[PDB]
């Protein structure tokens, strides 16, 4: 009981007459609230993963990206990718993550070559046109596209780079069509013995064996955390709550307080109100523009009034400067409750008869033990 | 008499954090010493008046 909370703090069993300070009262936050800017200009995922035609892997596309929001819910959550693998994040975490430069590479390959698009591989696609670095920290999205890119005669529009003098570097692209020399002899003209034209075109036919069937690749390459952020995952937001204490967040202005509607008008560029103390006292809502007074959640000392333990074991409690209407969040049964300039007084009766001061309660009030 | 003042030494030093409050327990009785120093003044403002 509050009496024991004195005896504990005073480190005494019998207690003398008086008003005694104990632990402070402080209202606990009713819920957490998250207020962020609306998800707005989304990234060009419909033009990247849903572009009608893709490139050939030899001449692999590099669609640079900036100034947009990277919501992947219409991406990972859809079954249309038979091979989405991330290599340096949980694919779940992407919405709660941010990226520096972004480059969507887009092209077509054989399914039995999709494995060679993973980092640290060998085989003609890894060796001669597309080769991911051993520390690749993008993500890779690939899918069977037999039903889109196969042709009954074979789709020889799409093509790989079969011959190369040497095995290439990560993110090197080659548009050479010069004749490969498989022998020690020099090669001249257009063709000859051990002269080879260095490209070849895929026989993507709809009848092809699974693996042989064409597959669409997008590499979400991004180089990260060396320049200011211009693309990010969506910062999810939540309903506004009012006239209750809460842990708030507005645009990364994390804090705690009772939120109330403000009369303050902010000029169109502003978002926060700060005091003489430079402490935050108000905030704009970033969705439904209006100004809100932050009032820090109601708090104050608990003071236990008592006659001496050598007299009685009945006691009273002051919550210093708290309005009675806030105490019930906690003796919130009430029964004897009174509200005063000093605070909320609980466990005592009011009497119009002005006795001499006995135990001081402050702000014109004293208390005593009587018939 | 001047304005009576009183402080929650945990809420000033470690406001809304258990994590700091643990590191404050290491220092022991100092916060109550400060409280008494302020509670002494605050009784004497009534007494002066």
């Amino acid at each position: 009981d509050p009496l024991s909370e004195t005896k504990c703090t005073l480190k005494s069993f019998t207690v003398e007459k008086g008003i005694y300070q104990t632990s402070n009262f402080r209202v606990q936050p009713t819920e957490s609230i998250v207020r962020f800017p609306n998800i707005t200009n989304l990234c060009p995922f419909g033009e990247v993963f849903n572009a009608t035609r893709f490139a050939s892997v030899y001449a692999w596309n590099r669609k640079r990206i900036s100034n947009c929001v990277a919501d992947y819910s219409v991406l990972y959550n859809s079954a249309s990718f038979s091979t989405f693998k991330c290599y340096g994040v949980s694919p779940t975490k992407l919405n709660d993550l941010c990226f520096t430069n972004v480059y969507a590479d887009s092209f077509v390959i054989r399914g039995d070559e999709v494995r060679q698009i993973a980092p640290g591989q060998t085989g003609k696609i890894a060796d001669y046109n597309y080769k991911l670095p051993d520390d690749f920290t993008g993500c890779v999205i690939a899918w069977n596209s037999n039903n889109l890119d196969s042709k009954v005669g074979g789709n020889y529009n799409y093509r790989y780079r079969l011959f190369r003098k040497s095995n290439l570097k990560p993110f090197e692209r080659d548009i050479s069509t010069e004749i490969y020399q498989a022998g020690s002899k020099p090669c001249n003209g257009v063709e000859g013995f051990n002269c080879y034209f260095p490209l070849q075109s895929y026989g993507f036919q709809p009848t092809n064996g699974v693996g042989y069937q064409p597959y669409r690749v997008v590499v979400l390459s991004f180089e990260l955390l060396h320049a200011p952020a211009t693309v990010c995952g969506p910062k999810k937001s939540t309903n506004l709550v009012k006239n209750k204490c809460v842990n708030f967040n507005f645009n990364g202005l994390t804090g705690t307080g009772v939120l109330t509607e403000s009369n303050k008008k902010f000029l169109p560029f502003q978002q926060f109100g700060r005091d003489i103390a430079d402490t935050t006292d108000a905030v704009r809502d970033p969705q439904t523009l209006e100004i809100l007074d932050i009032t820090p959640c109601s708090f104050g000392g608990v003071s236990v009034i008592t006659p001496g333990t050598n007299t009685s074991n009945q006691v009273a409690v002051l919550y210093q400067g708290v309005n009675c209407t806030e105490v019930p969040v906690a003796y919130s049964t009430g029964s004897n409750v009174f509200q005063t300039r000093a605070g909320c007084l609980i466990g005592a009766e009011h009497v119009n008869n002005s006795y001499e001061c006995d135990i001081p309660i402050g702000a014109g009030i004293c208390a005593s033990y009587q018939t | 008499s001047m304005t009576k003042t009183s402080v929650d030494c945990t809420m000033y030093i470690c406001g809304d954090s258990t994590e700091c409050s643990n590191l404050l327990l290491q220092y022991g009785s100092f916060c109550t010493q400060l409280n008494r120093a302020l509670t002494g003044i605050a009784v004497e403002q009534d007494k002066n008046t």
């Binding site: - | 003042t5 009534d46 008046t49």
Partner: peptide, 23 residues
């Protein structure tokens, strides 16, 4: 010409009307 951070100001036993009365 005349609460935050756990800092608080406590009211006097003798309110300005009682001071006006004693005076």
């Amino acid at each position: 010409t005349l609460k935050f951070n756990g800092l608080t100001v406590l009211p006097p036993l003798l309110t300005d009307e009682m001071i006006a009365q004693y005076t």
